[PDB]
Protein backbone atom coordinates (compact mmCIF):
# COMPACT_ATOMS: atom_id res chain seq x y z
CA UNK A 681 0.00 0.00 0.00
CA UNK A 682 1.95 3.01 -1.33
CA UNK A 683 5.77 2.91 -1.54
CA UNK A 684 8.24 3.57 1.23
CA UNK A 685 11.57 2.43 2.66
CA UNK A 686 10.30 -0.22 5.04
CA UNK A 687 10.52 -4.01 4.94
CA UNK A 688 7.17 -4.38 3.20
CA UNK A 689 7.19 -1.48 0.74
CA UNK A 690 10.88 -0.69 0.26
CA UNK A 691 13.11 -0.39 -2.85
CA UNK A 692 12.97 -4.19 -3.53
CA UNK A 693 9.16 -4.00 -3.89
CA UNK A 694 9.02 -0.84 -6.06
CA UNK A 695 9.22 -2.73 -9.35
CA UNK A 696 5.72 -4.20 -8.80
CA UNK A 697 3.99 -0.86 -9.28
CA UNK A 698 6.78 0.87 -11.20
CA UNK A 699 8.17 -1.56 -13.84
CA UNK A 700 10.76 1.05 -14.88
CA UNK A 701 12.58 0.08 -11.66
CA UNK A 702 14.39 -2.65 -13.63
CA UNK A 703 15.12 -0.24 -16.46
CA UNK A 704 18.30 0.33 -18.44
CA UNK A 705 19.25 3.74 -16.97
CA UNK A 706 18.33 3.55 -13.26
CA UNK A 707 19.99 5.51 -10.44
CA UNK A 708 21.84 5.66 -8.12
CA UNK A 709 24.98 3.78 -9.18
CA UNK A 710 28.39 3.10 -7.67
CA UNK A 711 31.12 5.37 -9.07
CA UNK A 712 34.22 3.24 -9.79
CA UNK A 713 36.86 6.02 -9.97
CA UNK A 714 39.36 3.89 -11.87
CA UNK A 715 36.79 3.14 -14.59
CA UNK A 716 35.38 6.65 -15.14
CA UNK A 717 36.70 8.23 -18.34
CA UNK A 718 38.27 11.67 -18.12
CA UNK A 719 36.52 13.56 -20.91
CA UNK A 720 38.42 16.79 -21.69
CA UNK A 721 35.58 18.15 -23.84
CA UNK A 722 33.35 18.52 -20.76
CA UNK A 723 32.99 22.24 -19.93
CA UNK A 724 33.10 23.70 -16.39
CA UNK A 725 29.79 23.81 -14.49
CA UNK A 726 28.07 27.18 -14.31
CA UNK A 727 26.03 27.59 -11.11
CA UNK A 728 24.12 30.90 -10.92
CA UNK A 729 22.04 30.95 -7.73
CA UNK A 730 22.43 34.67 -6.82
CA UNK A 731 18.77 35.49 -7.50
CA UNK A 732 17.29 32.28 -5.96
CA UNK A 733 13.94 32.65 -4.24
CA UNK A 734 13.11 29.97 -1.70
CA UNK A 735 9.47 29.82 -0.58
CA UNK A 736 8.54 26.82 1.50
CA UNK A 737 9.80 23.74 3.28
CA UNK A 738 7.62 20.66 3.39
CA UNK A 739 7.65 17.19 4.89
CA UNK A 740 6.20 14.95 2.15
CA UNK A 741 6.35 11.58 3.91
CA UNK A 742 9.70 10.44 2.44
CA UNK A 743 12.04 13.44 2.85
CA UNK A 744 11.76 17.21 3.30
CA UNK A 745 11.86 19.52 0.27
CA UNK A 746 12.83 23.19 0.22
CA UNK A 747 10.91 24.67 -2.76
CA UNK A 748 11.95 27.60 -4.94
CA UNK A 749 10.16 30.03 -7.24
CA UNK A 750 10.88 28.60 -10.75
CA UNK A 751 8.54 30.89 -12.69
CA UNK A 752 11.61 32.72 -14.02
CA UNK A 753 15.31 32.03 -14.61
CA UNK A 754 16.21 32.98 -11.02
CA UNK A 755 18.58 30.16 -10.08
CA UNK A 756 20.02 28.17 -12.98
CA UNK A 757 22.55 25.51 -13.87
CA UNK A 758 24.32 25.59 -17.25
CA UNK A 759 27.60 24.25 -18.57
CA UNK A 760 29.19 20.90 -17.88
CA UNK A 761 27.47 18.05 -19.84
CA UNK A 762 24.34 20.17 -20.32
CA UNK A 763 22.73 21.74 -23.34
CA UNK A 764 20.41 24.62 -22.52
CA UNK A 765 19.32 26.17 -19.24
CA UNK A 766 17.98 24.25 -16.23
CA UNK A 767 16.01 26.01 -13.41
CA UNK A 768 16.21 25.01 -9.75
CA UNK A 769 12.84 23.78 -8.49
CA UNK A 770 13.71 22.12 -5.14
CA UNK A 771 16.39 20.46 -3.00
CA UNK A 772 16.13 17.52 -0.53
CA UNK A 773 18.39 15.03 1.26
CA UNK A 774 18.66 11.27 1.73
CA UNK A 775 20.25 10.14 5.01
CA UNK A 776 20.78 7.20 7.29
CA UNK A 777 20.13 5.94 10.78
CA UNK A 778 23.90 5.72 11.32
CA UNK A 779 26.78 7.93 10.09
CA UNK A 780 28.18 5.16 7.90
CA UNK A 781 25.22 5.07 5.55
CA UNK A 782 22.75 7.42 3.97
CA UNK A 783 24.02 8.43 0.53
CA UNK A 784 22.43 6.92 -2.58
CA UNK A 785 25.50 7.11 -4.87
CA UNK A 786 28.70 5.52 -3.59
CA UNK A 787 32.34 6.19 -4.58
CA UNK A 788 34.39 2.99 -4.94
CA UNK A 789 31.72 1.32 -2.71
CA UNK A 790 32.08 4.02 -0.01
CA UNK A 791 28.75 5.23 1.49
CA UNK A 792 28.49 8.74 2.95
CA UNK A 793 26.28 9.98 5.84
CA UNK A 794 23.80 11.66 3.49
CA UNK A 795 23.36 13.12 0.03
CA UNK A 796 21.94 16.47 -1.11
CA UNK A 797 20.00 16.63 -4.38
CA UNK A 798 19.41 19.95 -6.13
CA UNK A 799 16.72 19.24 -8.77
CA UNK A 800 16.63 21.40 -11.96
CA UNK A 801 14.45 21.18 -15.11
CA UNK A 802 15.26 22.02 -18.73
CA UNK A 803 13.64 25.38 -19.53
CA UNK A 804 13.16 24.25 -23.15
CA UNK A 805 10.19 22.22 -21.88
CA UNK A 806 8.07 25.01 -20.33
CA UNK A 807 7.24 23.27 -17.06
CA UNK A 808 8.40 20.46 -14.80
CA UNK A 809 5.64 18.07 -15.82
CA UNK A 810 6.64 18.29 -19.49
CA UNK A 811 10.36 17.95 -18.65
CA UNK A 812 9.74 14.54 -17.05
CA UNK A 813 8.53 13.21 -20.43
CA UNK A 814 11.97 13.82 -22.02
CA UNK A 815 15.33 11.94 -21.81
CA UNK A 816 17.16 15.18 -21.03
CA UNK A 817 14.45 16.93 -19.02
CA UNK A 818 16.16 16.97 -15.62
CA UNK A 819 19.59 17.68 -14.17
CA UNK A 820 20.25 16.78 -10.53
CA UNK A 821 23.33 18.09 -8.72
CA UNK A 822 24.37 15.60 -6.04
CA UNK A 823 26.56 16.53 -3.08
CA UNK A 824 27.85 14.09 -0.47
CA UNK A 825 27.69 14.93 3.26
CA UNK A 826 30.48 13.69 5.54
CA UNK A 827 30.25 13.97 9.34
CA UNK A 828 32.77 16.38 10.80
CA UNK A 829 32.59 20.09 11.47
CA UNK A 830 29.33 22.03 11.28
CA UNK A 831 28.19 23.65 8.03
CA UNK A 832 27.02 27.22 8.95
CA UNK A 833 24.75 27.45 5.90
CA UNK A 834 22.79 24.30 6.75
CA UNK A 835 21.81 25.51 10.23
CA UNK A 836 18.76 27.49 9.04
CA UNK A 837 17.32 24.30 7.55
CA UNK A 838 18.08 22.44 10.79
CA UNK A 839 16.25 25.00 13.03
CA UNK A 840 12.89 24.85 11.24
CA UNK A 841 12.69 21.03 11.11
CA UNK A 842 10.78 21.13 14.42
CA UNK A 843 7.80 22.81 12.76
CA UNK A 844 7.50 20.24 9.94
CA UNK A 845 7.93 17.08 12.01
CA UNK A 846 5.15 15.01 10.44
CA UNK A 847 3.92 14.05 6.96
CA UNK A 848 2.03 16.92 5.35
CA UNK A 849 3.30 19.82 7.47
CA UNK A 850 5.04 22.74 5.78
CA UNK A 851 6.44 26.09 6.90
CA UNK A 852 7.16 29.32 5.05
CA UNK A 853 10.87 29.30 4.19
CA UNK A 854 11.96 32.53 2.57
CA UNK A 855 15.34 34.04 1.82
CA UNK A 856 17.40 30.83 2.00
CA UNK A 857 20.61 30.97 -0.09
CA UNK A 858 21.49 27.57 -1.56
CA UNK A 859 25.05 28.81 -2.28
CA UNK A 860 25.92 28.03 1.33
CA UNK A 861 25.53 24.30 0.59
CA UNK A 862 28.18 24.15 -2.13
CA UNK A 863 31.68 22.63 -1.68
CA UNK A 864 34.78 24.61 -2.71
CA UNK A 865 35.46 22.75 -5.99
CA UNK A 866 33.04 22.02 -8.78
CA UNK A 867 34.88 18.94 -10.15
CA UNK A 868 32.30 16.23 -10.98
CA UNK A 869 31.34 12.84 -12.49
CA UNK A 870 28.41 12.64 -14.90
CA UNK A 871 26.23 9.86 -16.31
CA UNK A 872 22.65 9.47 -17.67
CA UNK A 873 20.19 8.08 -15.12
CA UNK A 874 16.82 8.37 -13.37
CA UNK A 875 14.92 9.76 -10.37
CA UNK A 876 15.76 7.61 -7.35
CA UNK A 877 12.19 7.45 -5.97
CA UNK A 878 8.94 6.48 -7.72
CA UNK A 879 7.96 7.15 -10.47
CA UNK A 880 11.71 6.51 -11.24
CA UNK A 881 11.56 8.33 -14.62
CA UNK A 882 14.73 7.93 -16.69
CA UNK A 883 14.95 11.60 -17.48
CA UNK A 884 18.04 12.68 -15.53
CA UNK A 885 21.56 13.86 -16.31
CA UNK A 886 23.41 13.21 -13.09
CA UNK A 887 26.19 15.60 -12.01
CA UNK A 888 27.83 14.28 -8.84
CA UNK A 889 30.40 16.49 -7.09
CA UNK A 890 33.75 14.93 -6.19
CA UNK A 891 34.20 17.05 -3.02
CA UNK A 892 31.79 16.35 -0.13
CA UNK A 893 30.62 18.95 2.42
CA UNK A 894 31.03 18.40 6.16
CA UNK A 895 28.16 18.58 8.65
CA UNK A 896 28.24 18.14 12.44
CA UNK A 897 26.90 15.10 14.22
CA UNK A 898 24.31 17.39 15.85
CA UNK A 899 23.14 18.70 12.46
CA UNK A 900 22.50 15.22 11.00
CA UNK A 901 20.94 14.09 14.29
CA UNK A 902 18.11 16.61 13.75
CA UNK A 903 17.27 15.12 10.30
CA UNK A 904 16.77 11.81 12.12
CA UNK A 905 14.06 13.27 14.40
CA UNK A 906 11.56 13.73 11.52
CA UNK A 907 8.61 11.40 11.01
CA UNK A 908 7.49 9.38 7.97
CA UNK A 909 3.99 9.29 9.59
CA UNK A 910 1.37 12.05 9.82
CA UNK A 911 0.22 13.81 13.02
CA UNK A 912 -1.72 11.36 15.17
CA UNK A 913 -0.42 8.10 13.62
CA UNK A 914 2.13 5.84 15.40
CA UNK A 915 5.72 7.13 15.15
CA UNK A 916 8.16 5.88 12.49
CA UNK A 917 11.40 7.89 12.45
CA UNK A 918 12.41 9.17 9.00
CA UNK A 919 15.77 7.42 8.53
CA UNK A 920 17.35 5.34 5.78
CA UNK A 921 15.28 6.99 3.02
CA UNK A 922 17.83 5.89 0.41
CA UNK A 923 17.79 3.49 -2.55
CA UNK A 924 20.62 0.92 -3.03
CA UNK A 925 23.05 1.32 -6.00
CA UNK A 926 21.65 -0.06 -9.31
CA UNK A 927 23.41 -1.92 -12.19
CA UNK A 928 25.37 0.37 -14.54
CA UNK A 929 24.38 -1.75 -17.57
CA UNK A 930 25.49 -0.16 -20.86
CA UNK A 931 26.55 3.27 -19.54
CA UNK A 932 29.78 5.15 -18.99
CA UNK A 933 30.59 7.56 -16.18
CA UNK A 934 32.65 10.49 -17.43
CA UNK A 935 34.84 12.64 -15.15
CA UNK A 936 35.64 16.31 -15.59
CA UNK A 937 39.03 15.88 -13.87
CA UNK A 938 42.05 13.55 -14.05
Ligand SMILES: C[C@H](CNC(=O)c1ccc(S(N)(=O)=O)cc1)Cn1ccc2ccccc21
Pocket residue numbers: 797799808809810812820874875876877878879
Ligand atom coordinates in the same frame (compact mmCIF):
# COMPACT_ATOMS: atom_id res chain seq x y z
C1 LIG B 1 8.24 13.11 -9.54
C2 LIG B 1 7.55 14.39 -9.00
C3 LIG B 1 7.94 14.62 -7.54
N1 LIG B 1 9.25 13.84 -7.26
C4 LIG B 1 10.42 14.60 -7.61
O1 LIG B 1 10.27 15.73 -8.07
C5 LIG B 1 11.66 14.05 -7.39
C6 LIG B 1 12.81 14.79 -7.72
C7 LIG B 1 14.10 14.28 -7.50
C8 LIG B 1 14.31 12.98 -6.95
S1 LIG B 1 15.76 12.50 -6.74
N2 LIG B 1 15.95 11.90 -5.38
O2 LIG B 1 16.13 11.54 -7.76
O3 LIG B 1 16.63 13.62 -6.84
C9 LIG B 1 13.14 12.20 -6.61
C10 LIG B 1 11.83 12.74 -6.84
C11 LIG B 1 6.00 14.23 -9.06
N3 LIG B 1 5.55 14.04 -10.43
C12 LIG B 1 5.57 12.86 -11.08
C13 LIG B 1 5.03 13.08 -12.44
C14 LIG B 1 4.73 14.35 -12.47
C15 LIG B 1 4.17 15.14 -13.50
C16 LIG B 1 3.94 16.52 -13.29
C17 LIG B 1 4.26 17.12 -12.05
C18 LIG B 1 4.82 16.33 -11.01
C19 LIG B 1 5.05 14.95 -11.22
Ligand SMILES: [Hg+2]
Pocket residue numbers: 811812813814815816817881882883
Ligand atom coordinates in the same frame (compact mmCIF):
# COMPACT_ATOMS: atom_id res chain seq x y z
HG1 LIG C 1 11.94 10.91 -19.45
Ligand SMILES: [Zn+2]
Pocket residue numbers: 772773774797876
Ligand atom coordinates in the same frame (compact mmCIF):
# COMPACT_ATOMS: atom_id res chain seq x y z
ZN1 LIG D 1 16.88 12.81 -3.99
